[PDB]
Paper text:
In this study, we show that the catalytic activity of the flavoprotein monooxygenase (FPMO) PqsL can be triggered by blue-light illumination. The enzyme is involved in the biosynthesis of 2-alkyl-4-hydroxyquinoline N-oxides (AQNO) in the opportunistic pathogen Pseudomonas aeruginosa. It is homologous to group A FPMOs13 and has a relatively high similarity to p-hydroxybenzoate hydroxylase (pHBH), the most thoroughly studied FPMO14. In contrast, PqsL catalyzes the hydroxylation of an aromatic-amine group, a rather uncommon reaction, and remarkably shows no intrinsic catalytic activity with NAD(P)H as cosubstrate.
To render PqsL accessible to more demanding applications and analyses, we used a rational design approach, generating an enzyme variant with stronger FAD binding and thus improved stability. Our starting point was the observation that PqsL displays a deviation in its FAD-binding site where Gly45 replaces an arginine side chain mostly conserved in pHBH-related enzymes. Specifically, the equivalent Arg44 of pHBH anchors the pyrophosphate group of the FAD. The crystal structure of the PqsL-Q mutant revealed some local changes in the conformation of the 40-46 loop and confirmed that, as intended, Arg45 (replacing Gly45 of the wild-type) does engage the FAD pyrophosphate, which explains the 7-fold lower KD of FAD displayed by the mutant as compared to the wild-type protein (37.5 ± 6.7 nM vs 249.5 ± 29.8 nM, respectively). The increased affinity for FAD likely explains another favorable feature of the mutant protein: purified PqsL-Q exhibited an increased thermostability and no degradation at room temperature. Moreover, the flavin of the mutant protein is slightly shifted outward with respect to the wild-type conformation. We also found that neither cosubstrate specificity, substrate affinity nor KM values profoundly differ between PqsL and PqsL-Q, even though amino acid exchanges in PqsL-Q included positions designated to NADPH binding. The photoactivated reductive half reaction was assayed by NAD(P)H oxidation kinetics and revealed approximately 67% of wild-type activity. On the other hand, we can conclude that the more rigid conformation in which FAD is coordinated by PqsL-Q apparently does not hinder the photocatalytic reaction. Using an engineered variant of PqsL, we further demonstrate that stabilization of the protein-cofactor complex does not diminish photoreactivity, indicating that primarily the conformation of the flavin ring and its microenvironment are relevant for photoreduction.
Residue numbers in the entry: 4 to 370
Write the structure that this text describes.
């Protein structure tokens, strides 16, 4: 019952870590509270560095074979006029980004994990108790199915409300909510949306981001002040919302507005603002939403989870092969990832807090 790594959470971050460790021959058990099939809303965006991880995992061809989309442009509008146009490929060819539903990528990764004999995935399972040795390393973990494991390393890949973080490391985080919630819905795909990603914001705090997802659908991400968001999402046949959009979303996206046939399918997007001071303690490390929360206006939750996963895999690989002490490996992991995650956490908060003020908002983008 000795294992190398116990991963708490089989979300995109934990799955990626499991596969990368598995590919190297390490003995991994992944504990996931939900069913494997269980499919929810999630982030959709892979940035260049996340794409490089997927390429290194041998998955990049399959991503677009499974309905992932390469893109290289964004338009940003404020009060119905074009504020910025970005071409991410103008100077660098690999500047492109990918839109891929997080759950489709996760499914792809789990398919690959099935093939890795040294990884065992336990769905509808949880950690029940842990014991620490005299050096305060976790040396034994009891699951809720009675299974006892003896892992060298424990990883929290268990998301924004992380059990590992809160219950195994006793870290609490103070969370002050933003005044505008975010919601996401999935609609039919209009030609304007297939053509180009378009983000719209206005002086009264509206936001509407339209982008294609999968083969034949479109995502619409919206934000409004809390009270107004409730009012709009109550005319469930969507006339109120459509009218609201028409105030700040121009004719280029008329068919994308018309695709918003009702509001019942909208789901709230969790919002945090966090970059933890410590990514690890003892033989416990964390990744993704367990250590940082970026405002979802950035779309980068999945991206940074995958980036973390790759860096942690490299660190744990070195430690498990005896090339460096676990404590040095984990320090190196944090040193690499903390400033990258920090930059995006600061950027998201900047965008979300500035979007009513046109040149201020413009100012955040330029950087
Ligand atoms: C409902 C929803 C909608 C979202 N929509 C968007 C969006 O439109 N745009 C966007 O940019 N971002 C969105 N996000 C955020 C984005 O999905 C995350 O930032 C990203 O998936 C974080 O990756 P992760 O791997 O760190 O954690 P998660 O994806 O949170 O994965 C954590 C995993 O750990 C499991 N888990 C949690 N606690 C335990 C436990 N005690 N024991 C065992 N397993 C556990 C979970 O069931 C889950 O599978 C959304 C998130 C949610 C929940």
């Amino acid at each position: 019952n000795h294992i190398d790594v116990l991963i708490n959470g089989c979300g995109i971050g934990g799955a990626m870590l499991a596969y990368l460790l598995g590919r190297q021959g390490h003995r991994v058990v992944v504990v996931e509270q939900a069913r494997r099939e269980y499919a929810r809303n999630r982030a959709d965006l892979l940035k260049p560095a996340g794409i490089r991880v997927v390429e290194a995992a041998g998955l990049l061809a399959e991503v677009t074979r499974r309905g992932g989309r390469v893109r290289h442009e964004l338009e940003v509008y404020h009060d119905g006029e074009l504020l910025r146009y970005f071409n991410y490929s103008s100077v660098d060819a690999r500047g492109y980004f990918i839109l891929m539903p997080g759950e489709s990528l996760r499914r792809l990764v789990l398919e690959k994990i099935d093939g890795e004999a040294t990884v065992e995935m336990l769905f509808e399972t949880r950690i029940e108790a842990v014991q620490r040795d005299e050096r305060h390393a976790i040396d034994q973990v009891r699951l809720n199915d009675g299974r006892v494991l003896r892992p060298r390393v424990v990883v929290g890949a268990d998301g924004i409300a992380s059990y590992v973080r809160r219950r195994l490391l006793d870290i609490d985080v103070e969370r002050r909510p933003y005044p505008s919630p975010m919601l996401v819905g999935t609609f039919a795909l209009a030609p304007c949306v297939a053509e180009r990603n378009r983000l719209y914001v206005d002086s009264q705090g509206g936001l509407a981001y339209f982008y294609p997802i999968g083969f034949d659908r479109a995502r619409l991400v919206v934000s409004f002040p809390r009270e107004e968001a409730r009012e709009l999402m109550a005319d469930t046949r969507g006339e109120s919302l459509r009218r609201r959009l028409q105030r700040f979303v121009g004719d280029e996206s008329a068919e994308a507005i018309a695709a918003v046939t009702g509001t019942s399918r909208f789901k709230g997007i969790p919002i945090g603002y966090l970059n933890l001071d410590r990514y690890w303690a003892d033989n416990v490390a964390m990744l993704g939403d367990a250590i940082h929360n970026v405002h979802p206006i950035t779309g980068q939750g999945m991206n940074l989870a995958i980036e973390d996963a790759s860096a942690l895999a490299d660190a744990l690989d070195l430690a498990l092969r005896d090339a460096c002490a676990l404590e040095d490996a984990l320090a190196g992991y944090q040193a690499e990832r903390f400033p990258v995650n920090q930059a995006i956490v600061s950027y998201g908060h900047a965008l979300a807090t500035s979007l009513e003020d046109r040149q201020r908002f413009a100012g955040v983008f330029d950087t």
